Amino acid sequence: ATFEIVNRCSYTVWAAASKGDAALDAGGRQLNSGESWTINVEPGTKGGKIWARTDCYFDDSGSGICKTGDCGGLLRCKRFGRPPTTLAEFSLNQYGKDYIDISNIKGFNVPMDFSPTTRGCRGVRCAADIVGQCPAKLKAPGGGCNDACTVFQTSEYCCTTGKCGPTEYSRFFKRLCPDAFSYVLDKPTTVTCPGSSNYRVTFCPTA
């Protein structure tokens, strides 16, 4: 499947793509404002994620640090990134269907639209000013708005027992972005697309 990753933000981001134990395609790249990066994701990929990283510094070896979404100090990510990270999530060719969603379960750093470029399903978006409105206790100094599990490490926020409800913190994310997961057991906002669809992820879709 082809994913086109587009940075419409006015600032540089470092895109990342991983399935947790491996990079997808090159795994990461710098995207200046307006740049597009096309990657190929193998059919059948389960549990892939795409995210943006902000305020990164990398040397010529591809090693460094980012203030949001850092994946072990690498430009080319092999593992998932450190919160806060708005997440585009997908599992492809699962019994004939693709499944896509956006998630705030690991916080929010950059607004995003995640849409098919082929026919047969709708896209999803979280483009509200979550960072600007973020509750004081969830604000991340490096930038972004953390989720409550990352901050407080309780069974209720992390849903550790498999039983948990919405919270004051999850409802904040849900109020601003109803179409994104706000906690582990949120009513699913997953979109079902035809198997082998292609996609575009746009950072800062309105801004």
Domain containing 66 — which CATH number?
2.60.110.10
Technique used: X-ray
| Domains: count for the chain | 1
Domain hosting residue 126, numbered range:
1-207
**Tokens 């600007």 sit at which residue?**
132
Whether the Cβ atoms of residue 109 and residue 144 lie closer than 8 Å to each other: yes
Bridge pairing between strands 112-116 and 36-40: unpaired
DSSP secondary structure, 55-106, as one string: EEEE-TTSBEEEEES--TTBSS-SSPPPSS--EEEEEEEETTEEEEEEE-TT
The H-assigned helical ranges of the chain are 130-133, 148-152, 155-158, 168-176
Resolution (in Å) of the shown entry? 1.5
8 A C-beta contact, residue 204 and residue 7? yes
